[PDB]
Design a protein around this ligand. Structure first.
Ligand SMILES: CCCCCCCCCCO[C@@H]1O[C@H](CO)[C@@H](O[C@H]2O[C@@H](CO)[C@@H](O)[C@H](O)[C@@H]2O)[C@H](O)[C@H]1O
Ligand SMILES: CCCCCCCCCCO[C@@H]1O[C@H](CO)[C@@H](O[C@H]2O[C@@H](CO)[C@@H](O)[C@H](O)[C@@H]2O)[C@H](O)[C@H]1O
Ligand SMILES: CCCCCCCCCCO[C@@H]1O[C@H](CO)[C@@H](O[C@H]2O[C@@H](CO)[C@@H](O)[C@H](O)[C@@H]2O)[C@H](O)[C@H]1O
Ligand SMILES: O=c1ccn([C@@H]2O[C@H](CO)[C@@H](O)[C@H]2O)c(=O)[nH]1
Ligand SMILES: O=c1ccn([C@@H]2O[C@H](CO)[C@@H](O)[C@H]2O)c(=O)[nH]1
Ligand SMILES: O=c1ccn([C@@H]2O[C@H](CO)[C@@H](O)[C@H]2O)c(=O)[nH]1
Ligand code: NA
Ligand code: NA
Ligand code: NA
Lengths: 404, 404, 404
């Protein structure tokens, strides 16, 4: 029972220690506090009544902002996003391209507005400062960690851009890990519109901050000594719309391509499996088979660990967006398999991160532009950082499965 | 009656004089002629029979080019832009993304073709030359003013690009003002497809040329001494399609974002107004309340000035595209309020300009690239130029309301 | 009969000889072998049983990859690409924007994956080497010719990019000609989805390799002496999706614009023809009238040569994509004219090339970036190279019409 989870946590921490660049330099105050905050944050918002109330309050607000944003998409696509669509096409009346993608545009505009107004900086400063006084992490790395709660891996470091070129390897690694452990407001709204529970997405975003520092500081302890805008609000909103347009277009093409490539891989796997008596072989069977142990380890019941493995595996080998798109159907009454409410929570939490190999190329471009002489360092540390981020998502799922 | 309008005109001119950089350097020939042409142009095409006939003749031609362009969108979107759409979804069968936006693509291609063929240059040279001999404005600023009738603020100066780096501050200011006072062929076709009357759009585009010079030369009189391509027609058309694609994508994302942000602002305003006994508070009430005087001043009947204020206010604080999108419904039998045909004309004319604060950032990039050392000057003069452009749109609306 | 074709071939070769930069330097081994391979390849796959079987086998595979890729578009557009669309809108239920364009995205991703895995390089090396040992063409120009079977004119030279800056004028010209004579995997899948027969598209792509060298070496014989990557497979797929997105967007805007401009040209032609007693005058009549001789010359029956001319003419003056879009309707039971199965094959083959004037601007940018000092040479040789490519497509159509 609750024992299989506390071992899950122990195993995750252990792997990080085994992979550390220097176990003897690990600061127990830093890593102990970091775990304590991620664990307590979970308990607070997933277990204690007052916590559950703040979480549901924040989630309902987010759900309202989303609905407000949909007035814009309704203006652009009209009847193609109305109730009439379900009467005519049934299930296929939900057009993903017009229901989900335009949300990334509206959220980016909104986030850009909140930065111009100083609202983001205000929230980041309080959370980032809380982390550093509690953990002894540097100022710049703590701010980047907090910013990553709300924005993507290449956007979050912008709040400390002048300090990036000269941060320590341990600081730069943490900055990467905070990005890989979290997601971003725009896609969060996307996943929600796909049916993923907002409470889970919000909780996982907040837990990514200490989670990312926890595993960065286990795997890459500090061995050095750290140191230490649009003309108006309308231009801010337009610049945000433009960046989100570009994001929406990219995510759309990636989904058409990746989902297409998986179908082709499955056609090939069936013909190849056939030579070995397994004509039914598919990419989902390999991944389920291969990741079931890990799913079991974080608290998925033995009889659901294999289906859970498919989703977790897909997020790791491809990205969380392709994974969520294959997981969303299991969140509706038309699911091929009815999963426990606890297994749904665990999958939702473990998928909630940008941790995958392709995020390295993105960090090289985006985070690299802030410190062009540190691109060698980013490439070198890329794989470890993806592992760090993966461990953080897994730890959050274990904690969540525990308190549920 | 016709008295409330002639005072409207007087007030608009007066504000410009009050804001001038040097009232004593204002050239009466220049500003008197400029007003005389804008006023007479209106009379000619809105009042005198032969004028009304040329205008309706030009508008019908434009309406035919639009219909021709729709064959291309029909090929791409098929049934989604057919009559069957209205039978199935009713009013929401009109999909804005496929009905309006593709028109920007076709018009840009067409404009690019007419430049390659020398047809644009020919028309610009006649109108621009007529202006300068009549007003004593410089050659380059007069050409830019005429070009702005047909193309956007960043495209119009291209006909005089080699002379821009060295124009006088008064010349550069006029170039900006001609851009802010007008629109462009692509979006004109958009507004028409939305239901805005072509006659009004065309008339306002032509009146923007003297109107923009009028207010530039009132607010920034000349105190210095002024001076003085695609390989084939198919590449021209393709380069124009490509630029219009980019424009269509940007306008679409801006609409999803801005309309979304207004709905969120309204949710917030309702909760905030509620603390003061006004739970019904919205952004449209603030703007209507705030701009009613101005609407009244240009000839909107007292009892329609508040609804007129909403649209005029929205165009000023955001842009004309968001404004037209909220005004278009009042042009159909399904309008929340039936407005006089005179109030519809006045709103249509006063919305017909790129004059807003966000157009400054666009001028900095586009007009700045032609004269990188004059970017400081553009930023400095930005706000005055937006005011100049606003006065020009307002003056055109007053003149139009008068002759109707 | 079969005589009218062998004269077609003779005429095509003759024009090339007449236009040569030096008929006395033409290498008979090179040009004789090149023609022998194009002709024999046709015979092999269009006539001999075993050949027809390999071709239909390769075409069916391609047809399966396409269907696999459509799972991705189905996820993004849902009901708008389902069988229900035809019940509601009938013929107009086929939305080109969602049926055809997303295929360019999936194919680009796939091609990018096959390069990362070394599968493309492997196939190119065998075919390119076969060509050079047989023809005595240089190594680099032979590889570029083979690569052009599968990828576009600006992508194919990438397999020999370090050698491009220093190739001979005859080599550079051949590189251009291989691009103009062929198409690319992405658009091939597009044309197929439009109804064009895959067997024809595949056969024409393979015949473009010797065909392009044949006419390059007739028109620009060698008079000089020739000489002689994404971090992982997921980044490869994403980079390919992104490039194909950009391509899909461009092709879409070009189609809206060009088809729109043709409708406007037709409105104007009707009014102008009217002054000469031909109110029915259209762009298709001019092109059919003007290209009928050429269509007749390649084996189109006298009574179908005029309709065939429309399509061939349109591909030459605009591009093959606009042409295929006007030709596709004649491939369905709802065709305005029922054409012989032989006339359909001939049109399909003669349209199958990037040979048009606009492809020069594209070669300047793409091929020019590989050798910035050779841009002058590319511009100078552009028109001859388009003629060379056109002759290659025409020759392939004649050969095909012969063996059918
Ligand atoms: C959708 C279903 C199909 C899923 C199956 C796909 C599995 C592919 C695994 C990725 O392969 C590796 O990825 C690394 C990450 O990019 C590369 O690191 C190389 O590149 C840099 C990446 O960080 C360096 O950090 C590394 O040290 C190293 O040099 C490495 O070469 C590459 O072989
Ligand atoms: C959709 C409904 C909501 C509507 C409400 C929004 C109202 C916002 C008003 C804009 O605020 C100002 O805009 C100026 C224009 O950009 C800025 O000028 C600054 O920036 C340059 C702009 O030109 C300079 O010209 C100026 O002198 C100045 O420095 C200025 O700082 C900024 O405060
Ligand atoms: C859709 C229905 C309508 C169809 C009718 C359109 C017909 C237009 C024909 C194109 O005109 C020529 O195209 C050349 C190719 O671009 C140009 O070459 C010029 O530009 C370079 C192109 O290669 C050089 O190679 C040339 O030598 C030359 O200087 C040339 O100037 C231009 O006049
Ligand atoms: O704001 C965002 C959204 C997405 N992604 C990338 O796109 C993938 C799919 O969401 C993620 O894993 C991440 O690599 C970002 O980098 N930033
Ligand atoms: O050709 C165009 C079309 C639009 N816009 C910008 O987009 C806004 C919305 O139409 C305008 O106010 C203007 O700022 C341009 O600058 N040029
Ligand atoms: O991969 C591609 C696809 C299209 N095109 C260009 O786009 C036109 C339309 O397909 C072609 O003739 C060619 O000029 C390319 O250059 N490369
Ligand atoms: Na983040
Ligand atoms: Na203009
Ligand atoms: Na090719």
């Amino acid at each position: 029972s609750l024992f299989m989870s506390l071992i899950g946590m122990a195993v995750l921490l252990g792997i990080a220690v085994l992979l550390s660049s220097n176990r003897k330099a690990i600061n127990l105050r830093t890593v102990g506090g970091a775990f304590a905050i991620q664990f307590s944050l979970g308990a607070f918002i997933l277990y204690v009544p007052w916590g559950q109330e703040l979480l549901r309050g924040f989630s309902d607000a987010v759900s309202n902002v989303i609905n407000y944003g949909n007035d814009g998409t309704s203006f652009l696509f009209g009847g193609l996003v109305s109730g009439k669509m379900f009467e005519v096409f049934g299930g296929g009346g939900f057009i993903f391209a017009f229901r989900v993608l335009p949300t990334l545009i509206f959220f980016s505009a909104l986030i850009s507005v909140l930065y111009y107004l100083g609202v983001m900086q205000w929230v980041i400063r309080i959370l980032g400062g809380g982390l550093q006084k509690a953990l002894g992490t540097s100022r710049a790395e703590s701010m980047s960690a907090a910013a990553n709660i709300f924005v993507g891996q290449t956007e979050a470091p912008l709040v400390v851009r002048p300090f990036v070129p000269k941060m320590t390897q341990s600081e730069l690694f943490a900055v990467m890990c905070g990005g890989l452990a979290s997601i971003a407001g725009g896609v969060l709204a996307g996943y929600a519109s796909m049916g993923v529970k907002i409470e889970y997405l919000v909780a996982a975003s907040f837990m990514a901050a200490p989670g990312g520092l926890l595993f960065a500081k286990l795997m890459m302890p500090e061995t050095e000594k750290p140191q230490d805008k649009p003309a108006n609000v309308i231009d801010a909103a337009a610049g945000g719309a433009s960046a989100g347009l570009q994001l929406a277009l990219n995510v759309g093409a990636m989904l058409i391509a990746f989902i297409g490539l998986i179908a082709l891989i499955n056609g090939m796997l069936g013909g190849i499996g056939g030579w070995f008596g397994m004509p039914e072989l598919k990419l989902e069977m390999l991944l389920g088979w291969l990741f079931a142990p890990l799913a079991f380890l974080i608290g998925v019941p033995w009889n659901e660990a294999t289906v859970a493995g498919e989703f977790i595996g897909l997020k790791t080998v491809a990205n969380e967006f392709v994974a969520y798109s294959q997981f969303a159907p299991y969140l509706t009454e038309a699911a091929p398999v009815v999963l426990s409410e606890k297994t749904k929570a665990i999958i939702s939490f473990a998928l909630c991160g940008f941790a995958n190999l392709s995020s390295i190329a993105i960090l090289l471009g985006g985070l690299g532009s802030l410190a062009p002489k540190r691109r060698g360092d980013i490439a070198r540390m890329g794989v470890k950082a993806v592992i760090a981020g993966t461990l953080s998502n897994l730890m959050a799922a274990t904690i969540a499965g525990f308190f549920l």
